[PDB]
């Protein structure tokens, strides 16, 4: 259980959500309402519109 807990980054998902949530509120200011948090990452990766 020590190796398990030591290998798995328990807080990663909480850091991601917080980042994305705060990033979305920032985008809303830019007039871009995001209905899907996971999309923020994929957008910057867009090569074709």
């Amino acid at each position: 259980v020590a190796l398990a807990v030591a290998a798995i980054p328990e807080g990663l998902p909480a850091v991601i959500t917080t980042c994305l949530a705060l990033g979305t509120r920032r985008m809303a200011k830019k007039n871009a309402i995001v209905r899907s948090l996971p999309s923020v990452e994929t957008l910057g990766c867009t090569s074709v519109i």
Partner: protein
């Protein structure tokens, strides 16, 4: 003579997308003739460009042999007299090249393509169907908003990339530690209850702070990142591979140190600490002291302290990938500093506030003790600082 005119910002926005290496394809239910004319007015096609093989009606596209259809999608920028299906189909072909594709629309005839695309973008003044079928909505119907969202998207990902590597790099060192003591016969240098606190609070704040690192300037002057780009590979793998071993030996070391060279509980300087198990059983062996000296919360506090101190250092090393702190100072991200301070202040709290160290099985350490931790932790900065130097020189950059 009348026409349905393009929005004012459109042409400019198309140019910016182009500068960022992003292509724009028009997919419309309107006729080919006006679809091309609008494409010329907004800069998708040149004023006198030949578009015979760059513009198709949905039927013309359908007639192309199954092979050439896919290629046409990489070459053509205008599709007209299209049905709802044609849009999702075109999007699908684009995705067949492993391209991250976005779709912008306002009609219910766009719903299928908005669903199929990785990023469906609906107009603020468009239909509800389009909106509910999208990942994003342009509250101001402005195409420039797309570009700004792309820039934000790129910036956010560069930061996520950092704290991801950060938190995950930490987990590497922790595993090494747990494995060292396991095969080195040494006693528990770090219990799970301690690790959880480090991977949730100690490193939690630092990670979050990294999410607010300053974005690069040429971010929108670079092409799109490959979707298959691994977060950690190559020199960064070995680099993090090394940083992990260090933290694994610095923790297991600062723990064994107290058990041998510390002026608080000396032990077998011949590494017989490995048999701490055979104490209560065969006491008269080579002991001569209480066997509860191994379950002492002093050495573990030494291990954790090193871990925590190292991480805070690796947090400043996460501000940049291959840039020395001399180039990009630690104060570039004020939130990171306030972050490290909040973690350390919470470390002293988990040691002094009695109701805590008893739970985490810890015990505060004196000045001389900390001066030790700062001699096995701080050097980690110079360590990685060197590895970076080797990349931006001996390597590509």
């Amino acid at each position: 003579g009348m026409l349905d005119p393009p929005r004012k910002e459109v042409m400019g926005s198309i140019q910016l997308c182009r500068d960022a290496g992003i292509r724009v394809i028009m997919i419309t239910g309107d006729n080919k003739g006006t679809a091309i004319a609008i494409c010329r007015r907004i800069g998708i096609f040149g004023e006198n460009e030949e578009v015979a093989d760059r513009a198709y009606t949905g039927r013309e596209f359908d007639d192309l042999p199954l092979a050439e259809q896919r290629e046409a999608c990489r070459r053509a920028c205008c599709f007209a007299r299209v049905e709802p299906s044609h849009k999702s189909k075109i999007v699908e072909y684009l995705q067949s090249y492993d391209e991250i594709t976005a779709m912008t629309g306002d009609g219910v005839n766009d719903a299928p393509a908005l669903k199929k695309a990785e990023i469906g973008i609906a107009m603020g003044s468009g239909t509800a169907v389009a909106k509910t079928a999208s990942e994003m909505v342009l509250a101001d119907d402005n195409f420039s908003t797309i570009v700004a969202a792309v820039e934000e998207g790129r910036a956010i990902y560069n930061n996520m990339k950092q704290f991801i590597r950060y938190l995950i790099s930490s987990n590497v060192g922790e595993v090494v530690c747990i494995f060292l003591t396991a095969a080195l016969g040494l006693p528990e240098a770090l219990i799970p209850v301690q690790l959880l606190w480090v991977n949730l609070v100690t490193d939690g704040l630092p990670a979050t702070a990294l999410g607010f690192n300053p974005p690069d300037l040429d971010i929108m002057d670079r092409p799109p990142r490959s979707p298959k780009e691994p977060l950690i590979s190559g020199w960064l793998f070995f680099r993090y591979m090394a940083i992990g071993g260090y933290v694994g030996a610095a923790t297991v070391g600062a723990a064994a140190w107290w058990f041998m060279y510390a002026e608080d509980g000396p032990g077998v300087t011949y590494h017989q600490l490995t048999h701490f198990m055979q104490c209560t059983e065969d006491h008269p062996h080579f002991e001569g002291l209480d066997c509860e000296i191994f379950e002492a919360p002093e050495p573990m506090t030494m291990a954790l302290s090193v871990l925590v101190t190292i991480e805070m250092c690796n947090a400043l090393n996460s501000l940049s990938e291959n840039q020395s702190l001399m180039r990009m100072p630690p104060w570039v991200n004020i939130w990171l500093l306030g972050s490290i301070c909040l973690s350390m202040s919470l470390h002293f709290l988990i040691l002094y506030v009695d109701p805590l160290p008893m739970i985490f099985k810890l015990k505060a350490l004196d000045l001389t003790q900390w001066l030790m931790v700062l001699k096995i932790s701080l050097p980690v900065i110079g360590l990685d600082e060197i590895l970076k130097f080797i990349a931006r020189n001996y390597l590509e950059g």
